[PDB]
């Protein structure tokens, strides 16, 4: 575990911790899951927090986030792939990638989107398959 990795996870933790108070509530986990096209129930959101929770106090703080991010898998990558692959055809098109990305809080122009695809696209078909997705994650 390197100072550089610790730093990245910290910057990652921030994006979940909206109010910047230093805790992830189910309220903020719910904001994240929803902009990823999911609709978890308040008890599903509570189940996900117990997965990280060490105290039993209902919130994730940074040391608990780090424990988890560090402890860690094929199941979770496929699960992430599915968030992007909305029509379930096994390829992430530029429309689908743009769609997910704006929901998270960007507006990319078509050239920004195509740049990102070009970066991921090994076989040059202009869409991201699963092999290529592991590579970018």
């Amino acid at each position: 575990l390197t100072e550089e990795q610790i730093a990245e996870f910290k910057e990652a933790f921030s994006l979940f911790d909206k109010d910047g108070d230093g805790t992830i509530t189910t309220k903020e986990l719910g904001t994240v899951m929803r902009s990823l096209g999911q609709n978890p129930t308040e008890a599903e959101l509570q189940d996900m927090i117990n997965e990280v929770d060490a105290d039993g106090n209902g919130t994730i703080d940074f040391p608990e986030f780090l424990t988890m991010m560090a402890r860690k898998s094929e199941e979770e990558i496929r699960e992430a792939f599915r968030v992007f692959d909305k029509d379930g055809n096994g390829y992430i098109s530029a429309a689908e990638l743009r769609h997910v990305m704006t929901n998270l809080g960007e507006k990319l122009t078509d050239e920004e989107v195509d740049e990102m695809i070009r970066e991921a696209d090994i076989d040059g078909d202009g869409q991201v398959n699963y092999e290529e997705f592991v590579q970018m994650m």
Partner: peptide
């Protein structure tokens, strides 16, 4: 489950900067 969101977000941060 929760880790998938974690890596989508890591990718997302990695992409904003």
């Amino acid at each position: 489950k929760i880790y998938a969101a974690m890596m989508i977000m890591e990718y997302y941060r990695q992409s904003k900067a």
